[PDB]
Write a protein that binds this ligand. Structure first.
Ligand SMILES: O=C1CC[C@@H](C(=O)O)N1
Length: 301
């Protein structure tokens, strides 16, 4: 059996490095009965397209950024809310709280959640001095999701969505001067050529998820199914591992390259916390009882 797996990120990206090992694990564990071809850097499907591609079984498996789908259902927005889970442990616990509801929602559309891994803690790339939220008014902001567009609007920035595959170009032509993302993305797009500061706000840790079409899964023999699930579990473990481990490497490498890595003032964090509380209120209202259940489970961990 041959499957195709689109990802929106380049070969050098930590999630794709992990996906590369994952496809090798599926081959090895399934004894070669399942071969997955990776289509990287949005070459086959682009970020906004991948969930629909797997839903229709155009690709049997695919990697998405959960928060790209925040407008479709509140469950997708959760790991993009600022100042709710601001480290790897809190992020993993938020994930565990979210997971049953993510799986339920995906199941309603004929998909399975294979594994999910957090991007590194999100900071602000800017050329400006930002000591408080007001210092962000009027920023030419690059969003990578609906939620990150909302955050921009809430700080008075002016966002435009640009996928990572188009980010280097958007910076090089000056359409955007600032954004929130990881040291990972900053490094991989050589953001240091155009933008000189990264405020290490660790505001959230958004996850990617590898989704599988249920019908495609069901067509496989039991051993091959189990090989895929085991490869999936190994991928989750390794992905969280590599995400956290490389985070310090990217920050120090960005510094090597002339970027100022700056811890946020208490004032900047408090202002963004206020934005976060507003967004969580809004989210609870959209999400209803399921939102409350998720937040309760997260707060119990
Ligand atoms: O850290 C991240 C989250 C999504 C991706 C991006 O900037 O598009 N990099």
């Amino acid at each position: 059996t041959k499957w195709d797996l689109p990802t929106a990120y380049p070969a050098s990206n930590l999630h794709v490095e992990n996906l590369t090992q994952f496809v090798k694990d599926v081959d090895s564990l399934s004894g070669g009965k399942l071969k997955i071809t990776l289509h990287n850097n949005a070459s086959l499907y682009k970020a906004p397209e991948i969930k629909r591609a797997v839903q229709g079984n155009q690709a049997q498996i695919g990697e998405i950024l959960l928060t790209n789908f925040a407008n479709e259902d509140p469950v997708y927005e959760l790991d993009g809310l600022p100042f709710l889970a601001t480290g790897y442990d809190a992020s993993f616990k938020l994930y565990q709280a979210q997971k049953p509801f993510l799986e339920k929602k995906l199941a309603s559309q004929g998909m399975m959640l294979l594994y999910s891994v957090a991007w590194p803690p999100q900071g602000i790339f800017a050329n400006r001095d930002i000591k408080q939220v007001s210092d962000m008014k009027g920023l030419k902001w690059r969003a990578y999701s609906p939620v990150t567009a909302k955050i921009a609007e809430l700080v008075g920035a002016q966002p435009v969505t640009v996928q990572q595959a188009e980010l280097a170009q958007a910076m090089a032509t000056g359409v955007i001067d600032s954004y929130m993302s990881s040291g990972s993305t900053g490094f991989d797009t050589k953001t240091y050529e155009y933008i000189k500061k990264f405020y290490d706000t660790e505001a959230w840790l958004p996850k990617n998820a590898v989704l599988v079409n249920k019908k495609a899964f069901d067509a496989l023999d039991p051993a091959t199914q189990q090989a895929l699930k085991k490869a999936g579990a190994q991928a989750e473990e390794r992905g969280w591992k590599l995400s956290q481990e490389k985070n310090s490497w990217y920050k120090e490498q960005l510094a090597k390259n002339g970027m100022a890595i700056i811890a946020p003032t208490a004032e900047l964090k408090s202002g963004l916390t206020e934005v976060g509380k507003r967004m969580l209120d809004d989210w609870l209202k959209k999400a209803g009882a399921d939102g409350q259940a998720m937040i309760d489970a997260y707060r119990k961990q």
